[PDB]
Amino acid sequence: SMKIDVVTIFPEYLQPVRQSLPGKAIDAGLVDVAVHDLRRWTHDVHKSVDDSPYGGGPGMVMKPTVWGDALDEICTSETLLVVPTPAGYPFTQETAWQWSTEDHLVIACGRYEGIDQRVADDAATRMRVREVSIGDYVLNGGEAAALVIIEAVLRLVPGVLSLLEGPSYTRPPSWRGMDVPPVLLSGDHAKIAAWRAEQSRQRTIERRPDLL
Amino acid sequence: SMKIDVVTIFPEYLQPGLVDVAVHDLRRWTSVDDSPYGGGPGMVMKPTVWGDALDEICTSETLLVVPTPAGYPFTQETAWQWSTEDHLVIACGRYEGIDQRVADDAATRMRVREVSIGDYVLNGGEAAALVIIEAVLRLVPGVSLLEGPSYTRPPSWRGMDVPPVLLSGDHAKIAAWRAEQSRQRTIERRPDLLGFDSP
């Protein structure tokens, strides 16, 4: 049973998540994903969420006072506060597994140059905070990271949603002049397993030598 | 100028003038899946439907992108490389993935890239497509160390001060401080980027 709150200035971007949630899991009370517009917590008529960076430089920084109020309302001491950032610790499958048993994730999605660092630093004095990155590329903000994190985590919650895997095949046995490897149709399941292991080994060497 | 075509059995998921993005329902070219030859859990997407779809959508100049957890890593260098392409087609799998012959056949007439966006497991290629699209599009013409922390007003908030150097107006001191924060962060969080063992 997990609650996920996502805070973002683009709530419509989190649409694919609510599109991916089965009725059975929601109705059984296994999962609830709520998305919140950060501007609900702005102080001014212009609904300002950003301001110039101290020390200069390009772009804008998200205001701590707005985020502070949002997190004050949404988080409790039991919350796991997840902050996507390109400077984060790596989000991996081990992370997803660890987080899959949490009662409450709050995902704070930044835009512009990111969120004033005091927001996470203050939050970390009263709850668990995790700054993470989903990979070594640059996005426009945290929303796409949130989509990935939510999917990777929730698919590990029963009933909610190393070597590389080698090639897979299904019908038809011959297609555009390419036959399924005969070993797969041999009924020699020890040989099939060894063939698959070697395919996995080869693929890992070629594509992900960093894993060996 | 870039065209992106995304092919998926879950077009509803993809809802998020120099670039156009089109989403196509794979089922338009039809059951898209069956049990794997050789056994194993789950289902594999049949090559037949994919072949018909890609025949219609792709040309020889197409870069066919296939998200897969067994792919080569998609990185910022990849994003730069793809940013000058005229035409990306992203083939999103579901179930246990797409029959390998789809990529193999396509590779006889266009360039094919099997890639992974990270070391975690998704339910299909759609979220990976959204990530790839976002990372690439922000680099399209006309559109080392980890980033350090950023701060903005007020200079004191909840009794926490913006680091005083950032208020000093000393560009050299600020540059040095920011480099140091980035160094600390990279060593702590991503030591592999500086050629050290991972935790």
Ligand SMILES: CN1CCC[C@H](Cn2ccc3ccc(-c4n[nH]c(N)c4C#N)cc32)C1
């Ligand atoms: C200062 N920089 C410069 C470039 C653009 C940055 C935009 N941005 C603002 C908030 C924010 C959050 C996450 C991510 C992100 N990028 N790549 C990943 N793997 C991430 C993850 N998790 C990116 C983000 C800000």
Ligand SMILES: CN1CCC[C@H](Cn2ccc3ccc(-c4n[nH]c(N)c4C#N)cc32)C1
């Ligand atoms: C249990 N099985 C195991 C294999 C994958 C199955 C789901 N699936 C089907 C098609 C497909 C495409 C990409 C991804 C994916 N996962 N993680 C990443 N970095 C990806 C990327 N790019 C996952 C996918 C689920």
